[PDB]
Design a protein around this ligand. Sequence first.
Ligand SMILES: [Mg+2]
Ligand SMILES: [Zn+2]
Ligand SMILES: [Zn+2]
Ligand SMILES: [Zn+2]
Lengths: 263, 114, 133, 196, 43, 49, 168, 84, 772, 65, 98
Amino acid sequence: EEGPQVKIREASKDNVDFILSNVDLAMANSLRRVMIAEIPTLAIDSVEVETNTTVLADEFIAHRLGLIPLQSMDIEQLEYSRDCFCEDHCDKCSVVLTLQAFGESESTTNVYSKDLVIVSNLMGRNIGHPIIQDKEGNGVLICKLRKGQELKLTCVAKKGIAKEHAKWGPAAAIEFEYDPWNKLKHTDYWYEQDSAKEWPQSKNCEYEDPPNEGDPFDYKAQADTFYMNVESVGSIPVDQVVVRGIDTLQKKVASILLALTQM
Amino acid sequence: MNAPDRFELFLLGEGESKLKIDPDTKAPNAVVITFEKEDHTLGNLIRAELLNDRKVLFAAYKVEHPFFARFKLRIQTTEGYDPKDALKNACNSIINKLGALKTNFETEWNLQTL
Amino acid sequence: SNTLFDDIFQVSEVDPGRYNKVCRIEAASTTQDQCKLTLDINVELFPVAAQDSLTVTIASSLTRSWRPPQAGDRSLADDYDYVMYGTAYKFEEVSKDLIAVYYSFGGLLMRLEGNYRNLNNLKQENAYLLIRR
Amino acid sequence: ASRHGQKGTIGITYRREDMPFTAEGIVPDLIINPHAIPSRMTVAHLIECLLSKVAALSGNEGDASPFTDITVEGISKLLREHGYQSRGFEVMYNGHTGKKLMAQIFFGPTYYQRLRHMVDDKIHARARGPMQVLTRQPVEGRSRDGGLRFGEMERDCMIAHGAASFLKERLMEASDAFRVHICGICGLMTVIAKLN
Amino acid sequence: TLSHLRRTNTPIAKPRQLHNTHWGLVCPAETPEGQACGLVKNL
Amino acid sequence: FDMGGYFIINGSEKVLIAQERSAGNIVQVFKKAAPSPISHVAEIRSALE
Amino acid sequence: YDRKVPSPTGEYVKEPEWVLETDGVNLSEVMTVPGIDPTRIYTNSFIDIMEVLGIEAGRAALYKEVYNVIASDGSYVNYRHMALLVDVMTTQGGLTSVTRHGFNRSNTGALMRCSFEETVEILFEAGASAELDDCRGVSENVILGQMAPIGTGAFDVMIDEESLVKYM
Amino acid sequence: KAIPKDQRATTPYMTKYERARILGTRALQISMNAPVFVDLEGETDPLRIAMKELAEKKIPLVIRRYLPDGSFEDWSVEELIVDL
Amino acid sequence: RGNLMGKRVDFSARTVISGDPNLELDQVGVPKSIAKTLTYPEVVTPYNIDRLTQLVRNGPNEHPGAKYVIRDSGDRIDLRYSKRAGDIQLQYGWKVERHIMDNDPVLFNRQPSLHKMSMMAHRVKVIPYSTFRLNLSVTSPYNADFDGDEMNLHVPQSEETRAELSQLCAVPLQIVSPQSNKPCMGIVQDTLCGIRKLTLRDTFIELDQVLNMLYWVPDWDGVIPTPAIIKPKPLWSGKQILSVAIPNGIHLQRFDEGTTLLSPKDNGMLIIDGQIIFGVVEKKTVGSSNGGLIHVVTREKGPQVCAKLFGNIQKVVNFWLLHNGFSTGIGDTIADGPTMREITETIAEAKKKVLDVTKEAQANLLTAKHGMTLRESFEDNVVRFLNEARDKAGRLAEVNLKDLNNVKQMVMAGSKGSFINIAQMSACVGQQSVEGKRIAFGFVDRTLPHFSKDDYSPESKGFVENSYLRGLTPQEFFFHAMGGREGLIDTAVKTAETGYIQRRLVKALEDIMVHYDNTTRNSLGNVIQFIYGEDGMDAAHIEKQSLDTIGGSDAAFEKRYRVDLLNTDHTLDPSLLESGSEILGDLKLQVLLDEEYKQLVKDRKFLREVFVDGEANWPLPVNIRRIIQNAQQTFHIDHTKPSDLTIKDIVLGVKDLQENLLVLRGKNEIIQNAQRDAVTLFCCLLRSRLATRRVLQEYRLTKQAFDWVLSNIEAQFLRSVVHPGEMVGVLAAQSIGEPATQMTKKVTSGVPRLKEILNVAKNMKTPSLTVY
Amino acid sequence: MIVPVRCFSCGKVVGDKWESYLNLLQEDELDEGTALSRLGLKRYCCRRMILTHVDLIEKFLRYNP
Amino acid sequence: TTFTHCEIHPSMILGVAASIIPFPDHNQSPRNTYQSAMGKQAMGVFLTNYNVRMDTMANILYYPQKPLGTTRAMEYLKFRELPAGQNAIVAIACYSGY
RNA sequence: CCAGGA
Ligand SMILES: [Mg+2]
Ligand SMILES: [Zn+2]
Ligand SMILES: [Zn+2]
Ligand SMILES: [Zn+2]
């Protein structure tokens, strides 16, 4: 087609395995960094506690509520409250979640991310839905109550990035490898007898030609072709972790061009 | 307690420009751009692209201390060529490269049935 | 601005004692019997085995900062295969009309033993080392 | 600290992107210095790790019990069965550039303990504050907003430096300093100074 | 809490050293550093 | 999981620490040092149970 | 023991010797023994060296001894430091110890002396015998809240109206 | 008793302590709005002013150098060599 | 003692310390909260008035703000509560008690404080987070680490006090210490480890990284050095790009075992004009070493220049290592399969050698060494074999570990660990001792109840056969535990014994200082030393130098020093100097070379009288070797053309310089003879290094080169003298005290001996005569 | 006490997987290592989260108010 | 051939604190002595009834973890039920020099 | 005093 090229190896709701050729390592990495840190997500940010009869602390629970993944598909049409014009929050900038739970049962009563209810007007946008990947359809286990154990609270979810808090991290681990045969001599293999026998062969070795000993060292050789795997948490779909990552980095660069323009 | 606010990493300070371009004294046709509320994510990316420019003689960036999200980038170009223009072109090249990367990923993704 | 030494030597031995990417090479001039040479070479870049005939050149030129490309249009003063830049560090008077000069190419050491090049070699930061074949 | 007398404080906290990473996408929670290990000879720390790495993958309790027939070779073999390099090394990539590290990092889980000593309960500063009644000198301890002790050994260093005026200040202006009226005949503090 | 309920105090020849007779009765490692070193035994 | 072994005095837990003493009623011979009129002593710290 | 000695040819060469090592001291007697070098004989007991060879030798032995303690641990302290200590213990005419007995019992001022070991007793005697403190010691000036005659305070500073009116 | 200028025998060079004390003293005086004997070439820190005054030997101070007996030699800052 | 000699003080602050590779040597990271509390009282003056008014406006909560305003009237205005804290209009002479700000001088201290270097002046750097941050190379003087150490901060309140700190006790000034006349701060840990790695021949850097490594140097000229390899592919070496941190004029030479001018093993060191020619940089080069890159830099360029070099060397090295990486694993303790067989069989044979001496002793055939029990003699042998063994086994592994061994790598750079650590970890732990002897029979005739009685076997008396990698048997474990406990006991005790020794030394010496008569006196004016340390020199200004004259053959001396213008073979060749041809047979001139040689011979005998052993290397002021080196690069000395010197130029020039090496000034025989005395030794060195033959044949100096060398010896020598005011008393006490604090025929030695010595102990523990 | 939502090292939600893991052990009799892997917990950072958890909450619930 | 008794288990020579040290037979003697002092200052769940008791100061770890490397002796020490730490992913590396 | 920290 044009410049750098992609070749997807495997896909799911949760994973994207692909090959990125005709790219600078610096670019591959900068994208990898952005996916981890700069993609916006919606996550619980304020927790007003009306009642808590639980064995857990108000803030212990509060902390967990932030780590619960929320639907951030249409996150782009929500404003950062900081940029919003209200007094604290509103609809244009937040999602209000409610959680009322009580131990009616003699048996232990469980509190799940499913038990969260949206109270704010969604403006008909795909946002704030607790992500349920759970087979039984419960989502994240927030708490356990016994008998008169009541938990009544209110959550304000806000747009944010992983730089502010890791709760707004839409990506789990991002796998990243290049040159499975150390052709580039980018690592000096620690060994005891044989580095080839001692160090396990990469999966990606199959997608590259072995060096063949009867050849001189390619110094001219440079790093292109990157075997990556992007894992999603739920907030954004796997593809959009890649796309939005590409786009964020693009926007980030545009700001610099624009800054120079104003100067 | 002595902990700085987390947004200080990305949100520009009161009266604080993203870029501050100062000229290098020690070398002819060389400049020093300080990037506020930025990290390696952008620094190493720009530096590597300026390296691809033939008319660029010197390019390097450094995050002088990790407590602060800012980096100094030094650009030296051949006489007649402007380092601000060099930075402008590398910035553009990056965008155009990313634009193709997105297009190529999108096309390839749409082909998958999973 | 011009050449300072030229001769073709033949490598007797190549030594990588613990060094993975560098080798001390022992050579002698095919022309002059009096002439010998000791030299550390990046063998990962330009490989050398024993009995190889190599043209070894000096030259004081072809100052200020260093520039990378444009060398496509620029006159590559290298009709040679491997080039180094280093400093002359000692002038050993090894008896008679015999002299020996020491060169350090950023740690990569060199010792040239001969006689004639009294009117050539100098104690200068400027000294290139060119090798072909 | 680990369970091997290998104590320390946090020097910095780095986000995931700045951290070095395995090709597999794994990142450390903690980075400890190679310089600890040699002088200290805390071999069990290294073994704890190797065994804990196997344990984590195998889903079996790693027996780190004292006098046993478990060998570093035994555990090594088990780790190779899991796809990792037997001696616990893993190739890491630099977080800032993405470039492979020329070194391979000894990486794996290790049980770390959180100790009672936290910086914020320690940090203390004073600049004029409560004074004792008797001696009219700064009160004691962080608790009471006390001043620190410029003690005998500190006096000595100042005397060694030749910091005559810096010392006088520490002992006077910066603490104790008072004014009396004395008699010229019997050099006593007898004087009824009705200075007014 | 456990190690506090197994603590031994020795008030006032070479008491601080780990004696052979301490085998199986007192811990060879659990002792303080400084002043009380080897005078505070742990069962 | 609490294991007992302490007392409760005015609401704070208290642990008696075992005190180590020389067993009594024990015959022990010791060489009395170089500058001494007495060269050796047989001691018995006799006490009732 | 191995001994470095100049050879006829000039160069210093290893010429080892037989040396005796005692388990006890009697200087006076072993010195007068035929077959030894009474010019070379050494004892670790510098108290003996002092008594037999004078205070000067007492100083040399005392340094030798101090030096050994440091160098045995594989440490280096510049001569002057050890020399000074050795000299201070010496000057009085004998072996003045770095103890409440030795130095602290000299003619230095009561306030300075009371700052170490015998405090109240030093001050009671000070009173009883009408002692006069020179106020030359560091210690007295510290007790007085005055700038001590130490480095920075070892001289005085004056304005000169002559030089002042010269610059304007 | 005060040693005559023609009989002075202490160093013709300024001691580290002397220089530190002159700089301290001038800086203190400069800071207490004392008259400055030099062109402040934009200077504002009294120590950097003091350094400048000493650099041009325009400091009107004298060092009274006491001898263990009680006598002394007076030396002008203008006359003391500043090799420090 | 508690309210007067020491005092609790205001303007003090304390917190947990942590390191920082990004702080400059002389600065200190100060937490914002600490800066917002500590205050400096600044007088309102035309110069600061506007600035001060702003900090006042800023107030007590904003960082660069203020807490109080002190009016002429004497009453204090609290900016926190005053209704007029806004509309506060300053007046010249008032005081603004403002926050501590970036670049304020502050006293930083780590207790105990058995050093003048335990309290040093740093530049403030207000930073976030609750810890005091310090540069890593400043760790050593304080004796700090970051395992939970806290440090003290004191703030001066006067312009005078500040000057005292900045001008006398600032960190750069403290680099070369008088304690041991060498640097007391050097390159450590990561930077030491990374420095070896960077400077190997193997180590080459690509353009990209070279540019970042260059930019990282804050004073970099902007000049990209020409790559050591220009095609195929431009490549720079570690040596090359490290040399950018090394300032111009810096000259260094060091020969390690087997160093040639071709340094095959990349041995020793050769830095010419602040550019590395050969050898790997490590502890000996860049550490707190006597010959050090630091020692030379402080001395040659200045304390402020050297302090910058620390930061520079670290900014490059740390950056490089950040990207190279460095680790350490169990694999680094693991030794070869056959090396382990070879180790096992080393212990095995030593185990028999021991049984053999045991069987020999049980059969009453053993013959005791004069002055020892038959048993004492036996135990000595056993203990000796078992150690010989532990070491052999160790040296086996040490050799079998490749250069890729991360432990070996740390040991090689000198960053951490020694031989024994490898040995004990990889091969064999070894014999365990308590009170010097092997584990004794605590139980009746046995070490443990798992043994038979009268068992003198290695296994019974505490020989730990196994490596730490292999693991210890319960018996080995308990014996190691006994032996281990012994060290913890002395660590514990020594701590207070050592402390009190320090106190007594200080209290006995306190009042001693150098007076304006170069005399060392106490508070009584009683002379202790006539001249400080018998030479009248400051210890910092001294360096180990070789007195050539001292050794060699009488013939070798002759060749080096003798000039005979009346002999065709022993004249100075006309190649040496211009006057060479006209100089032959000059009887008048020969009279001068006779004096010269006759003095050199005089000197030789004299030095042989002082240093009886013939030891040439002594600490003396003025590194003459370096002055010559500099003259040579400064003047671009042509080792071919003949000199423009006269014999009179050299001979008399030196004679004259000598008269200008002033320590004592008085105009009188006593003081003049005194001056001669103090200067004696230095002159023997001076005359040895500046004799005619030497200057011309060796140094090849021109007249201007020589004229310059002479002026520099003079200048340096004068700078080298002690400063009246120096509190040499305390200095000496602390210079003995501090080392005593680090202390672990058989004679009573170390801490308990020092105790014997200081106490003038009558009944000493090991009295002994040494009968020659 | 109470299963961590998200693995500390990579942040893969681990909050849902608890009961499911405990079930694959009682009901399926399965060994810990297979159950973890069944649940898709592949990286050891994620594995250690569940494998080494101590659900103290269940004891805490045993007290009345 | 004389053996009157046998050792139940040699690891029993150790006290409560040293019994949490993994492979103490592979450490230098004092490093073990150090751990049996530090673990006393390590945070964790001290008792399950923490929420019902009024004590001056109480430190409880949010998410305690049982150790991956354990001692057979810990079974009796209730350590896996009431832990003092968390299994951290640890790299032994030289990084930013921090 | 008692308990602890470097
Ligand atoms: Mg410490
Ligand atoms: Zn809003
Ligand atoms: Zn009166
Ligand atoms: Zn994970």
